């Protein structure tokens with residue numbers, strides 16, 4: 667069982683999570699075709715995810731990664747947008763659902779920028795938009811994304827669009843660069859869905 671703990675907007679933990687969410691919005695070449703047209707979000711609530719078994723898989727895998735990377739797990743807080751968010755908070759990240767069409771191959775993707783993860787809340791290319799109004803730029807429906815603990819360990823920095831089924835020897839993750847940085851992991855137990863964020867994209871005035 668998963669427990670969702672509501673963080674209060676007065677909490678420094680909440681202020682930190684939203685600040686990171688708001689401050690990392692940037693412009694995309696698709697002119698917001700996938701995620702929608704916005705300059706800001708409207709944060710409805712932020713919740714801490716608590717699952718005893720998913721923390722066991724994650725903490726077990728950190729120990730393994732640090733032994734292979736000189737007592738350093740190189741953990742980063744990264745965004746994740748998925749049409750599978752409900753299955754992640756209950757059963758965890760699963761590499762059997764890796765993004766086949768990814769630039770850096772069949773792995774699990776994470777963004778530094780909330781704007782990039784927002785383009786995947788409804789699927790690849792914004793899917794067919796929100797389930798109610800079939801709108802990729804819907805300002806009514808409450809969207810969701812995760813702010814995750816990601817054990818990167820030894821990252822392999824990639825620049826070319828080279829499809830990899832697994833990380834290169836000695837490495838635990840792949841960082842791809844050219845408009846923004848993409849973080850790829852090949853093991854589901856290398857991310858923990860720390861925060862579940864419920865928000866809306868805002869129609870500019």
Ligand SMILES: Cc1cccc2c(=O)[nH]c(-c3ccc(CN4CCC(N(C)C)CC4)cc3)cc12
Nearest residue numbers: 746747748763764765766775776777783786848
């Ligand atoms: C590219 C990228 C960069 C940075 C951040 C992100 C991010 O937040 N999410 C994703 C993302 C998430 C979920 C899905 C949907 N899956 C794909 C696999 C699929 N197959 C096996 C049938 C089933 C639906 C596709 C992409 C990509 C991404």
Ligand SMILES: [Zn+2]
Nearest residue numbers: 796799804807
């Ligand atoms: Zn809608």
